[PDB]
Design a binder for this molecule. Sequence first.
Ligand SMILES: *[C@@H]1O[C@H](CO)[C@@H](O[C@@H]2O[C@H](CO)[C@@H](O[C@@H]3O[C@H](CO)[C@@H](O)[C@H](O[C@H]4O[C@H](CO)[C@@H](O)[C@H](O)[C@@H]4O[C@H]4O[C@H](CO)[C@@H](O)[C@H](O)[C@@H]4O)[C@@H]3O)[C@H](O)[C@H]2NC(C)=O)[C@H](O)[C@H]1NC(C)=O
Ligand SMILES: *[C@@H]1O[C@H](CO)[C@@H](O[C@@H]2O[C@H](CO)[C@@H](O)[C@H](O)[C@H]2NC(C)=O)[C@H](O)[C@H]1NC(C)=O
Ligand SMILES: *[C@@H]1O[C@H](CO)[C@@H](O[C@@H]2O[C@H](CO)[C@@H](O)[C@H](O)[C@H]2NC(C)=O)[C@H](O)[C@H]1NC(C)=O
Ligand SMILES: *[C@@H]1O[C@H](CO)[C@@H](O[C@@H]2O[C@H](CO)[C@@H](O)[C@H](O)[C@H]2NC(C)=O)[C@H](O)[C@H]1NC(C)=O
Ligand SMILES: *[C@@H]1O[C@H](CO)[C@@H](O[C@@H]2O[C@H](CO)[C@@H](O)[C@H](O)[C@H]2NC(C)=O)[C@H](O)[C@H]1NC(C)=O
Ligand SMILES: *[C@@H]1O[C@H](CO)[C@@H](O[C@@H]2O[C@H](CO)[C@@H](O)[C@H](O)[C@H]2NC(C)=O)[C@H](O)[C@H]1NC(C)=O
Ligand SMILES: *[C@@H]1O[C@H](CO)[C@@H](O[C@@H]2O[C@H](CO)[C@@H](O)[C@H](O)[C@H]2NC(C)=O)[C@H](O)[C@H]1NC(C)=O
Ligand SMILES: *[C@@H]1O[C@H](CO)[C@@H](O[C@@H]2O[C@H](CO)[C@@H](O)[C@H](O)[C@H]2NC(C)=O)[C@H](O)[C@H]1NC(C)=O
Ligand SMILES: *[C@@H]1O[C@H](CO)[C@@H](O[C@@H]2O[C@H](CO)[C@@H](O)[C@H](O)[C@H]2NC(C)=O)[C@H](O)[C@H]1NC(C)=O
Ligand SMILES: *[C@@H]1O[C@H](CO)[C@@H](O[C@@H]2O[C@H](CO)[C@@H](O)[C@H](O)[C@H]2NC(C)=O)[C@H](O)[C@H]1NC(C)=O
Ligand SMILES: *[C@@H]1O[C@H](CO)[C@@H](O[C@@H]2O[C@H](CO)[C@@H](O)[C@H](O)[C@H]2NC(C)=O)[C@H](O)[C@H]1NC(C)=O
Ligand SMILES: *[C@@H]1O[C@H](CO)[C@@H](O)[C@H](O)[C@H]1NC(C)=O
Ligand SMILES: *[C@@H]1O[C@H](CO)[C@@H](O)[C@H](O)[C@H]1NC(C)=O
Ligand SMILES: *[C@@H]1O[C@H](CO)[C@@H](O)[C@H](O)[C@H]1NC(C)=O
Ligand SMILES: *[C@@H]1O[C@H](CO)[C@@H](O)[C@H](O)[C@H]1NC(C)=O
Ligand SMILES: *[C@@H]1O[C@H](CO)[C@@H](O)[C@H](O)[C@H]1NC(C)=O
Ligand SMILES: *[C@@H]1O[C@H](CO)[C@@H](O)[C@H](O)[C@H]1NC(C)=O
Ligand SMILES: *[C@@H]1O[C@H](CO)[C@@H](O)[C@H](O)[C@H]1NC(C)=O
Lengths: 125, 125, 130, 130, 441, 48
Amino acid sequence: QVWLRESGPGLVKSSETLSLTCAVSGASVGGNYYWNWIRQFPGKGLEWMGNVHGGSGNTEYNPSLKGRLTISRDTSRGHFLLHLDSVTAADTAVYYCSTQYWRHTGYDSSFFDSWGQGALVTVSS
Amino acid sequence: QVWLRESGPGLVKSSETLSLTCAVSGASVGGNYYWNWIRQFPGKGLEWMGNVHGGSGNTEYNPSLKGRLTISRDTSRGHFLLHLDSVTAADTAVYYCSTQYWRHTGYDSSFFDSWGQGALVTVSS
Amino acid sequence: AVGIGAVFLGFLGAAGSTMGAASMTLTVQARNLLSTVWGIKQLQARVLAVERYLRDQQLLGIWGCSGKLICCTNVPWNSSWSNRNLSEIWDNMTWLQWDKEISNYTQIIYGLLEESQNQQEKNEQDLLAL
Amino acid sequence: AVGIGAVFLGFLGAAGSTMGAASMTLTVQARNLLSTVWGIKQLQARVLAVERYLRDQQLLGIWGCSGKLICCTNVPWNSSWSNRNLSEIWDNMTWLQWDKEISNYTQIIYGLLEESQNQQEKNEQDLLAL
Amino acid sequence: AENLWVTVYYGVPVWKDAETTLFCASDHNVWATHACVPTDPNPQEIHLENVTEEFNMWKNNMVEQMHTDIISLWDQSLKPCVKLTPLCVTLQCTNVTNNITDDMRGELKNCSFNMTTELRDKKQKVYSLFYRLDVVQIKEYRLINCNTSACTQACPKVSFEPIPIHYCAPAGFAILKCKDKKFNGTGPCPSVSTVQCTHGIKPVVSTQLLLNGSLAEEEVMIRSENITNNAKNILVQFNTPVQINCTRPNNNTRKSIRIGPGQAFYATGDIIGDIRQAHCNVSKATWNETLGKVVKQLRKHFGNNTIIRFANSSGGDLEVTTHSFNCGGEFFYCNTSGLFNSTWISNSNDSITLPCRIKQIINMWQRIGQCMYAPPIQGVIRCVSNITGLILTRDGGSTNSTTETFRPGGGDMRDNWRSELYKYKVVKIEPLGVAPTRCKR
Amino acid sequence: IRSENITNNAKNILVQFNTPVQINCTRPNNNTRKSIRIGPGQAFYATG
Ligand SMILES: *[C@@H]1O[C@H](CO)[C@@H](O[C@@H]2O[C@H](CO)[C@@H](O[C@@H]3O[C@H](CO)[C@@H](O)[C@H](O[C@H]4O[C@H](CO)[C@@H](O)[C@H](O)[C@@H]4O[C@H]4O[C@H](CO)[C@@H](O)[C@H](O)[C@@H]4O)[C@@H]3O)[C@H](O)[C@H]2NC(C)=O)[C@H](O)[C@H]1NC(C)=O
Ligand SMILES: *[C@@H]1O[C@H](CO)[C@@H](O[C@@H]2O[C@H](CO)[C@@H](O)[C@H](O)[C@H]2NC(C)=O)[C@H](O)[C@H]1NC(C)=O
Ligand SMILES: *[C@@H]1O[C@H](CO)[C@@H](O[C@@H]2O[C@H](CO)[C@@H](O)[C@H](O)[C@H]2NC(C)=O)[C@H](O)[C@H]1NC(C)=O
Ligand SMILES: *[C@@H]1O[C@H](CO)[C@@H](O[C@@H]2O[C@H](CO)[C@@H](O)[C@H](O)[C@H]2NC(C)=O)[C@H](O)[C@H]1NC(C)=O
Ligand SMILES: *[C@@H]1O[C@H](CO)[C@@H](O[C@@H]2O[C@H](CO)[C@@H](O)[C@H](O)[C@H]2NC(C)=O)[C@H](O)[C@H]1NC(C)=O
Ligand SMILES: *[C@@H]1O[C@H](CO)[C@@H](O[C@@H]2O[C@H](CO)[C@@H](O)[C@H](O)[C@H]2NC(C)=O)[C@H](O)[C@H]1NC(C)=O
Ligand SMILES: *[C@@H]1O[C@H](CO)[C@@H](O[C@@H]2O[C@H](CO)[C@@H](O)[C@H](O)[C@H]2NC(C)=O)[C@H](O)[C@H]1NC(C)=O
Ligand SMILES: *[C@@H]1O[C@H](CO)[C@@H](O[C@@H]2O[C@H](CO)[C@@H](O)[C@H](O)[C@H]2NC(C)=O)[C@H](O)[C@H]1NC(C)=O
Ligand SMILES: *[C@@H]1O[C@H](CO)[C@@H](O[C@@H]2O[C@H](CO)[C@@H](O)[C@H](O)[C@H]2NC(C)=O)[C@H](O)[C@H]1NC(C)=O
Ligand SMILES: *[C@@H]1O[C@H](CO)[C@@H](O[C@@H]2O[C@H](CO)[C@@H](O)[C@H](O)[C@H]2NC(C)=O)[C@H](O)[C@H]1NC(C)=O
Ligand SMILES: *[C@@H]1O[C@H](CO)[C@@H](O[C@@H]2O[C@H](CO)[C@@H](O)[C@H](O)[C@H]2NC(C)=O)[C@H](O)[C@H]1NC(C)=O
Ligand SMILES: *[C@@H]1O[C@H](CO)[C@@H](O)[C@H](O)[C@H]1NC(C)=O
Ligand SMILES: *[C@@H]1O[C@H](CO)[C@@H](O)[C@H](O)[C@H]1NC(C)=O
Ligand SMILES: *[C@@H]1O[C@H](CO)[C@@H](O)[C@H](O)[C@H]1NC(C)=O
Ligand SMILES: *[C@@H]1O[C@H](CO)[C@@H](O)[C@H](O)[C@H]1NC(C)=O
Ligand SMILES: *[C@@H]1O[C@H](CO)[C@@H](O)[C@H](O)[C@H]1NC(C)=O
Ligand SMILES: *[C@@H]1O[C@H](CO)[C@@H](O)[C@H](O)[C@H]1NC(C)=O
Ligand SMILES: *[C@@H]1O[C@H](CO)[C@@H](O)[C@H](O)[C@H]1NC(C)=O
């Protein structure tokens, strides 16, 4: 089982850069995994923000968050970081880091899903 | 086949140091080859100047040019350089870099000789 | 007689050349070292060829020269083994002659190399301990 | 009973000494590992001796300690495997006792070593890509 | 705090018990040393200090390997030899009654028969001398083995003399030898060495007595898998040998009969002079002293006040009931009844003579369907040998009595090998090892 | 149904059933065996 834990500051001033970390336990960040960053606004639905591939390093971002969202990996420390520039009051939300993958153990195959507890980030001056 | 190309400045002032380069293509400078520097004065016969062994690095110079002629190799860049100090008006000539070697491939042995097009160097203030 | 190049690409073409000239074609010799009345002979030949190569590789690896064709080590050259200069060895002699001359003092060099490699490994471990 | 030196140059002379003392004579043991009713037995013996040595060499090379007799790695020592201190292991025990004590937890360390070596190779390639 | 990491060491001196196949080392023989590797002039032995090993003679695997190799060599040596298929013909036998004593009366038969020749349409009339143990009545007799299987004749050039053999293990394996004296073949041995391989072991084949063996360096040694159980044979090793002199004094004569193209059968022509039985001599005082030592050592395991009886064999085949051996090519079977006949209670130049018989049709190992016809030897034969142990068995042993009776045993030849390979074992090295250390890659 | 070249008549056709068909074979004669010794340790088993 892959365990994901979110961390970062609880408050970020407006127009600053929000930095978040997600630490992975039980699996290697450099493996053939996709790590996805999603957020949920208060009293609203979820909104996928982006994701990164552990092996090649290619990153795919939502068009709405393009130009301000960055996702990076760290295999030596075994965690992946997220940066969001020019955060405004509308960016207050609960952020989650998740991953989905097929495990093909010889004869058998199984779909595995993992999410983190999530971290609440409030943007205000 | 071994290809040799000469290069260097077309004019050198009197009493300066003439520097010439010969680049080798199709063979390794570090192999068991002898690289020879020769010159031809205008309207006169040839005159061998010097040579160097690619492997050991021993250099043999003409007694007349001794004390002012240097020949060096460069395996990483695959070319050999020539330096002549205190060049005078009598040193104007066409310089050539050549190499002769026996190639014993299995049953058959052959003699190969390669010359460069040559570079004209004029010495004058 | 001087100022002539020689290049060889045969199996043992450089056997008659000098040590310096012959030291440029080690790989061509390296390739070939591995590869009812007749089948048993073939099997014995295969087994012997494997055994000799494995012994040579083990001996090379014990000295720390594993995976190298020209590996120089830290053991100094004792003057009692030979007294010639490098000019008269690498440009005036052949590998066969050198082997015929130096076959007497091989095991001592082998043991010294083994001991030096072991000491170097222990020193490296001690340095990495910090 | 204290302040006495012991040195062994036999095949298995250091079998009865402590781990620290016995770790200084690895090469002497390393040398020996390779070398009609009776000929077949000899052939089978030779084949088995070659196979075991090749298996050991492959296992050593997979972990990244190829061509080395002492090689420490990046894998931390899990406290569940053992709880003694270095003073009571390298100066109060023999290799046979240690092997008898640790034989239950051998494969996990091997798998961790292989995975760590693969990750290190991938990281080295990524670093050299730049 | 600890900050320890795994470290790999190659070449660690660690070994484990294992089973493997050993090969020859040795300096016309049935035990072919031609395909056996030469032995080094100076064997190397490395004593291991402060090393105590576990040993068990009764579960050694080298004994089975030695038995299998001995049987294989014996079978191989007999392949290129004459097959005595024509010999299964009706015989006409009479009694040999000239210059015969009162004990050899009727022990020999003068048998005439018809035989083939080199030409396949001609026959010859021949005669021979046979032992009574070889012929069975059908005035007409036939060989005993004819209704079981036809079987070969031993080639007259291969010698049955034992030759020492050393059994050496492959690379990656080691032979551990227990140098501790007074070791009874089971348990922890504290004094140990590693040997290149074993010493010379003569494959001497005999029953009820161990001949030309190895002597204990301290005293008489008694060994048994479970001494409490009476179904396990007891092995006795003497610390000093007892000389025994065996002889066949008949002056035999050998003749050759051509039974085909390049095929000859060796028959006994006639006996020149007197006819007397073969016999063995053993000293009396030496035997009494040896039995005194044996009973003294036996009293340790069976109480210090018991009565120790030595008696005759129980019964069965002639091979197991009698001390059977071969001396100079002739197969002797002898009656060791005057030796194990005495009783011991807790508290000069004469000798014992065993009279005994010779046989020619041999079923060497405990098998059925394969013989070995020993050609006759010419002239008187005599040999001298050592006795260096016994194979005993405790009859009964119930608590109803306060006395112990021991009888000679044998039959199984593995026990002959077990008396020599009791201080050896084979192990395999495991150089790889993992330890905790401080250095980090 | 399998065949290397079904168009050619020289190639056999292999048929594999999806279910088996039971077949019961029997020899009902009560035979007797007798051994005749034809040599040393050699017997021939005839029908008595
Ligand atoms: C325990 O050990 C002792 C000693 O260690 C053993 O006693 C020795 O036994 C050997 C073998 O019997 C004996 O050596 C023989 O001595 C005879 C008398 O000198 C020799 O005649 C005989 O040679 C013949 O046999 C050889 C094959 O073994 C032939 O190669 C040789 O040519 C001889 O054969 C010729 O002669 C015969 C008869 O005329 C003829 O048929 C042949 O065709 C050929 O022409 C052996 O050398 C020793 O002398 C004994 N030692 C002592 C001190 O007596 C004892 O046997 C061992 N115990 C057991 C149970 O094995
Ligand atoms: C075994 O029997 C044979 C044949 O009966 C004996 O050979 C004969 O010996 C007598 C001498 O008494 C000769 O006159 C005959 O000519 C012999 N017969 C042949 C066919 O040669 C032989 O002596 C007997 N041997 C013994 C030990 O009794
Ligand atoms: C060897 O063979 C001969 C014949 O080839 C045997 O002599 C015959 O014996 C039978 C007895 O069954 C008689 O009926 C014949 O009349 C005999 N023939 C002759 C020509 O005498 C002889 O007995 C055989 N020898 C032995 C020892 O059995
Ligand atoms: C019977 O035993 C005696 C004594 O144990 C043996 O004689 C010894 O033989 C060895 C041969 O290596 C000599 O080194 C000893 O010196 C001998 N001892 C004496 C007291 O002389 C004799 O060899 C044995 N017999 C056989 C056939 O092995
Ligand atoms: C040695 O032999 C004795 C005698 O057989 C063994 O003791 C017997 O063990 C069996 C096993 O259940 C019992 O049924 C018998 O009643 C026992 N008999 C006596 C007299 O004790 C003994 O176990 C054997 N030793 C070993 C180590 O196996
Ligand atoms: C075994 O012992 C007996 C005596 O019990 C020996 O018999 C004597 O042998 C000699 C031979 O030199 C004769 O001179 C005597 O006449 C024999 N005496 C008797 C009473 O028979 C016999 O020789 C011994 N055999 C061996 C092989 O030692
Ligand atoms: C067995 O034979 C040996 C040798 O034939 C006997 O030893 C000889 O004994 C006589 C009589 O005491 C001595 O004169 C000789 O010097 C001895 N020879 C040797 C080489 O020791 C031995 O006594 C015989 N044993 C028996 C029981 O008969
Ligand atoms: C051990 O000794 C006993 C008695 O001394 C032997 O028993 C004799 O056996 C023979 C058969 O060969 C009989 O004819 C005798 O009548 C028996 N004697 C008695 C008193 O009954 C026994 O045979 C001997 N053992 C061996 C193996 O020979
Ligand atoms: C082994 O030797 C003993 C001792 O002589 C034999 O016992 C004798 O056997 C005969 C029968 O052949 C009896 O007449 C004697 O009375 C027995 N002697 C004693 C003292 O009882 C024994 O028979 C021999 N073994 C064999 C198989 O014959
Ligand atoms: C299957 O078999 C048919 C019949 O033989 C093959 O067709 C023949 O091919 C040969 C080859 O030249 C011709 O000569 C015949 O005239 C053909 N006969 C017919 C009826 O077409 C066909 O080629 C075979 N299939 C394969 C794949 O080889
Ligand atoms: C095969 O089928 C036949 C019937 O067609 C069987 O014949 C019968 O066998 C039984 C045996 O129990 C007899 O009682 C009947 O009288 C037989 N009838 C006839 C008409 O022969 C035959 O037994 C079968 N055999 C097998 C091996 O199944
Ligand atoms: C001998 O070994 C034992 C344990 O195997 C050890 O306790 C003892 O100290 C050793 N002897 C010496 C002199 O080191
Ligand atoms: C031969 O002698 C034995 C023993 O004396 C006897 O049993 C047998 O009947 C004799 N056979 C003859 C005289 O044919
Ligand atoms: C051969 O004959 C003997 C004696 O007649 C007998 O004991 C034996 O059993 C026979 N062999 C077989 C195989 O029956
Ligand atoms: C003798 O054998 C017994 C078998 O139970 C064993 O317990 C004992 O240790 C042995 N003797 C020695 C000195 O090892
Ligand atoms: C046996 O007989 C032969 C032939 O007569 C003779 O040469 C030999 O000496 C005899 N054997 C003995 C021990 O006398
Ligand atoms: C057995 O010993 C007794 C002693 O009581 C003796 O009388 C008898 O003759 C002996 N038997 C043999 C066969 O030696
Ligand atoms: C065959 O005959 C034997 C001998 O009478 C008998 O025991 C057996 O039962 C018969 N077989 C059947 C099938 O009845």
